[PDB]
């Protein structure tokens with residue numbers, strides 16, 4: 001578990017990329033013969049000892065899965081010490097996959113979506129082998145390096161399970177409800193199986209080309225809806241077989257939820273025959 005502390009001076013923080021509640025991400029160049037494009041994250045209220053603890057937590061969680069890694073999981077490049085702690089991570093040039101599936105909504109063939117789902121299961125399965133619960137699997141949180149290369153990011157909420165710990169006990173802060181499993185909302189319990197549901201939802205995000213899930217339903221009513229047994233709809237483009245998968249991720253019995261290993265097998269199987277499973281217009 002190693003951090004690489006990098007010299008504040010070598011970065012020229014070009015512009016911002018997008019600010020959240022949690023923090024603010026900047027693109028910028030890093031020039032230690034070549035120049036390297038990078039992304040830079042620092043949290044809101046970056047002077048506070050709570051907001052310097054959480055960012056170094058993120059850096060830790062991230063660095064103790066760096067080796068050997070996985071081509072579908074962003075690596076830390078290091079951190080910068082200024083007045084605050086900055087997290088450096090190589091710039092994905094095509095941005096998040098949510099943004100993507102919107103802008104390019106009319107030119108994405110089945111072979112891409114179905115490959116992305118395998119790449120993401122691959123990203124997550126490794127993480128699981130590394131005893132890490134991402135806690136925030138979304139489409140906003142999937143960076144595109146190239147159309148055949150997608151990577152997972154944002155370990156703000158990510159946590160590590162102890163040697164014999166099965167689940168994580170969230171001292172509820174601010175969490176993204178419409179991505180969480182039932183048991184994650186009621187009892188604040190997070191599992192690998194809780195990331196499966198998040199995947200399930202993220203899948204739904206992509207298939208719909210970046211629709212907002214449970215649109216215009218207030219956060220509150222969500223758990224209720226789910227307890228009724230209401231799930232997100234079957235997207236227009238998807239057959240039953242693909243939707244049947246999404247619907248397994250969302251089952252109350254977390255241990256009846258499919259595994260990331262099972263998902264790679266399933267989505268590869270489909271990704272080999274992309275048009276048999278997804279009906280895109282003009283595909």
Ligand SMILES: *CCC(=O)Nc1cc(Nc2nccc(-c3cn(C)c4ccccc34)n2)c(OC)cc1N(C)CCN(C)C
Pocket residue numbers: 017018019025027039089090091092093094095096097098099139140141143153154
């Ligand atoms: C979905 C929003 C998004 O990520 N958008 C962009 C991402 C870019 N690249 C990039 N590369 C590495 C890491 C990150 C990154 C990680 N985290 C936690 C981020 C939060 C906010 C923004 C970026 C984050 N991002 C990127 O560089 C090409 C551009 C974007 N833009 C184009 C999307 C604008 N978005 C605010 C709506």
